[PDB]
């Protein structure tokens, strides 16, 4: 399951990705389109586990975003950390305003 995280990191960090694709590869997109309702679950379990940690969060967010565009108590645990990150990024944006002004 660690190498899963590894591959998920690689597919979204590609030097140059296929445009018009969620993750960046139509294959793994097709993959995330089809799972067994107990595969998707394990996947988002690992997505929670990774979303907890800052450095691996954006990849888990990409995977989660790809997953959220494909389908109709744990989602809480994802939501909270996701909102935390959202605020962190908002702060980054305020800084971006300062930087934008200086020049």
């Amino acid at each position: 399951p660690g190498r899963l995280l590894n591959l998920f990191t690689n597919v979204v960090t590609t030097r140059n990705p296929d445009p018009d694709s969620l993750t960046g590869l139509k294959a793994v997109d097709d993959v995330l389109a089809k799972l067994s309702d107990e595969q998707i679950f394990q996947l988002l379990l690992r997505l929670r586990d990774w979303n907890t940690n800052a450095r691996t969060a954006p990849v888990a967010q990409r995977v989660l975003w790809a997953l959220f565009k494909s389908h109709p108590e744990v989602l809480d645990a994802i939501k909270v950390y996701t909102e935390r990150h959202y605020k962190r990024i908002e702060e980054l944006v305020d800084e971006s305003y300062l930087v934008e002004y200086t020049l």
Binding site: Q61, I78, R88, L92, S96, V99
Partner: protein, 134 residues
């Protein structure tokens, strides 16, 4: 005081990285004249991930800066450790013609930021709807 060694570490990483980048740039440029060429010669076995990792190992000179800007813009383009990249841009601007490069880098940064911000907004919204539908 050890930050001096860290500084020479990142300066060397900049020389190595910029040289490698130029090597591949030249390779691809000259790949256009003849497809059949031997591959480039890189030192260790890429290519921004090195500069990134040697930049992430440190705990929180003028000549070296343009190369650093090139790699900064490169981080921005590949969505690579955006907080670190933003902090770096802010620090570079805070101390020390190149201004246009800075405009480029900040543009790419703001773009990456908006991309993932919107992405997290979407994910949160979805999580709310699906939680509500439970």
């Amino acid at each position: 005081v050890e930050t001096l060694m860290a500084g020479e570490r990142i300066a060397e990483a900049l020389e190595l990285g910029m040289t490698d980048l130029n090597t591949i740039r030249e390779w691809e440029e000259a790949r256009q004249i003849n497809p059949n060429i031997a591959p480039p010669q890189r030192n260790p076995i890429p290519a921004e991930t090195y500069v990134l990792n040697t930049l992430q190992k440190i705990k929180p000179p003028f000549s070296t800066i343009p190369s650093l800007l090139t790699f900064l813009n490169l981080f921005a383009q590949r969505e690579l450790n955006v907080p670190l990249t933003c902090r770096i841009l802010f620090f570079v601007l805070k101390t020390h013609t190149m201004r246009a490069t800075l405009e480029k880098v900040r543009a790419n940064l703001r773009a990456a930021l908006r991309r993932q911000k919107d992405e997290m907004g979407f994910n949160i919204a979805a999580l709310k709807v699906v939680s509500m539908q439970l």
